């Protein structure tokens, strides 16, 4: 038996059995976080409009 | 009368040597990485007792989004503005000592006064650059630099005031 975070696909069904899916998810994209940016000169006018 | 000359010279050597010493050390005194001091070029610890080139404007952990690290950090690097104050002050004392003789009633004193006060502006602006980029206590010769800028400003006041005094003599005797 395979009790593990295994992704279920057609070809994987084509060879073995899977129970009903218990936890749903999607493909995820991960990056490095940048530091909290400081505005600078823009703070002179930044708010209230463009 | 000659009080203008006195205050002028004592302002020259005063703010000049004071700016130099400001370039020397005692610009920022605080815990290092452990406590040390630094003068925008190299920090010196209390290992302890030695020094190290500390003005490493780049550091190998950042993101550098867009002209923020490069332009600003580089501007604070090499201490351009305070060096501009150095050169401009040099022109200050040099051009005033030039104004000693070779009369040229009007142009010189006004000129050196202008470049001298504006030199002060370069000094303050540079200080702004420094305190800005540094983002705990300050160095004492830092206060020597600011005070140098101030005494410089007053010296410029006496300068231009003496210039318009000369104008008062000329236009006065003109009639």
Swiss-Prot record, chain A:
Compartment(s) where it occurs, according to its Swiss-Prot or TrEMBL record: Cell membrane; Postsynaptic cell membrane; Postsynaptic density membrane
Tissue and organ distribution: Detected in forebrain. Detected in dendrites of neuronal cells. Expressed in the pyramidal cell layers of CA1 and CA3 and in the granule cell layer of the dentate gyrus.
Post-translation changes: Palmitoylated. Depalmitoylated upon L-glutamate stimulation.
Induction (free text): Down-regulated in the pyramidal cell layer of CA1 in the hippocampus by global ischemia.
Binding site for L-glutamate: 5, 7, 12
Similarity comment: Belongs to the glutamate-gated ion channel (TC 1.A.10.1) family. GRIA2 subfamily.
Something else known: The postsynaptic actions of L-glutamate are mediated by a variety of receptors that are named according to their selective agonists. This receptor binds AMPA (quisqualate) > L-glutamate > kainate.
Subunit structure and binding partners: Homotetramer or heterotetramer of pore-forming glutamate receptor subunits. Tetramers may be formed by the dimerization of dimers. May interact with MPP4. Forms a ternary complex with GRIP1 and CSPG4. Interacts with ATAD1 in an ATP-dependent manner. ATAD1-catalyzed ATP hydrolysis disrupts binding to ATAD1 and to GRIP1 and leads to AMPAR complex disassembly. Interacts with GRIP2. Interacts with GRIP1. Interacts with NSF via its C-terminus. Interacts with CACNG2, PICK1 and GRIP2. Interacts with GRIA1 and SYNDIG1. Part of a complex containing GRIA2, NSF and NAPA and/or NAPB.
UniProt free text on domains: The M4 transmembrane segment mediates tetramerization and is required for cell surface expression.
Known function: Ionotropic glutamate receptor that functions as a ligand-gated cation channel, gated by L-glutamate and glutamatergic agonists such as alpha-amino-3-hydroxy-5-methyl-4-isoxazolepropionic acid (AMPA), quisqualic acid, and kainic acid. L-glutamate acts as an excitatory neurotransmitter at many synapses in the central nervous system and plays an important role in fast excitatory synaptic transmission.
Record-given protein name: Glutamate receptor 2
Organism: Rattus norvegicus
Organism placement in taxonomy: Eukaryota, Metazoa, Chordata, Craniata, Vertebrata
Gene: Gria2
Curated annotation (Swiss-Prot), chain B:
Transmembrane regions listed in the UniProt entry: 5-25, 78-98, 108-128, 144-164
Keywords: Calcium, Calcium channel, Calcium transport, Glycoprotein, Ion channel, Ion transport, Membrane, Phosphoprotein, Synapse, Synaptosome, Transmembrane, Transmembrane helix, Transport, Voltage-gated channel
Superkingdom per UniProt: Eukaryota
Record's protein name: Voltage-dependent calcium channel gamma-2 subunit
Membrane topology according to the record: Multi-pass membrane protein
Function of the protein: Regulates the trafficking and gating properties of AMPA-selective glutamate receptors (AMPARs). Promotes their targeting to the cell membrane and synapses and modulates their gating properties by slowing their rates of activation, deactivation and desensitization. Does not show subunit-specific AMPA receptor regulation and regulates all AMPAR subunits. Thought to stabilize the calcium channel in an inactivated (closed) state.
Molecular function GO labels: calcium channel regulator activity; channel regulator activity; ionotropic glutamate receptor binding; voltage-gated calcium channel activity
Keyword Phosphoprotein: yes
Subcellular location per the Swiss-Prot or TrEMBL entry: Membrane; Synapse, Synaptosome
GO cellular component, one term: hippocampal mossy fiber to CA3 synapse
GO annotation terms (biological process): eye blink reflex; membrane depolarization; membrane hyperpolarization; nervous system process; neuromuscular junction development; neurotransmitter receptor localization to postsynaptic specialization membrane; positive regulation of protein localization to basolateral plasma membrane; positive regulation of synaptic transmission, glutamatergic
SS bonds (residue pairs): none
Subunit structure: The L-type calcium channel is composed of five subunits: alpha-1, alpha-2/delta, beta and gamma. Interacts with the PDZ domains of DLG4/PSD-95 and DLG1/SAP97. May interact with GOPC. Acts as an auxiliary subunit for AMPA-selective glutamate receptors (AMPARs). Found in a complex with GRIA1, GRIA2, GRIA3, GRIA4, CNIH2, CNIH3, CACNG3, CACNG4, CACNG5, CACNG7 and CACNG8. Interacts with GRIA1 and GRIA2. Interacts with MPP2.
Family: Belongs to the PMP-22/EMP/MP20 family. CACNG subfamily.
Keyword Glycoprotein listed: yes
Native organism taxonomy: Eukaryota, Metazoa, Chordata, Craniata, Vertebrata
Species per Swiss-Prot/TrEMBL record: Rattus norvegicus (Rat)
């Amino acid at each position: 038996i395979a009790i593990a975070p295994l992704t279920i696909t057609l070809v994987r069904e084509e060879v073995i059995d899977f129970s009903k899916p218990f936890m749903s998810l999607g493909i995820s994209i991960m990056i490095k976080k940048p530091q909290k940016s400081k505005p600078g000169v823009f703070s002179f006018l930044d708010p209230l409009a463009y | 009368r000659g009080v203008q000359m006195l205050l002028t010279t004592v302002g020259a050597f005063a703010a000049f040597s004071l700016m130099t010493i400001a370039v020397g050390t005692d610009y920022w005194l605080y815990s290092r990485g452990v406590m040390t001091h630094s003068g925008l070029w190299r920090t010196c610890c209390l290992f302890k007792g030695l020094c190290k080139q500390i003005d490493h404007f780049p550091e190998d952990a950042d993101y550098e989004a867009d002209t923020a690290e490069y332009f600003l950090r580089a501007v604070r690097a090499s201490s351009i503005f305070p060096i501009l104050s150095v050169i401009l002050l040099f022109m200050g004392g040099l051009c005033i000592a030039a104004s000693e003789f070779y009369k040229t009633r009007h142009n010189i004193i006004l000129s050196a006064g202008i470049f001298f006060v504006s030199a002060g502006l370069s000094n303050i602006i540079g200080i702004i650059v420094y305190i800005s980029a540094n983002a705990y206590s300050y160095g004492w010769s830092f206060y020597f630099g600011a005070l140098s800028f101030i005494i410089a400003e007053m010296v410029g006041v006496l300068a231009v005031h003496m210039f318009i005094d000369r104008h008062k003599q000329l236009r006065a005797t003109a009639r």
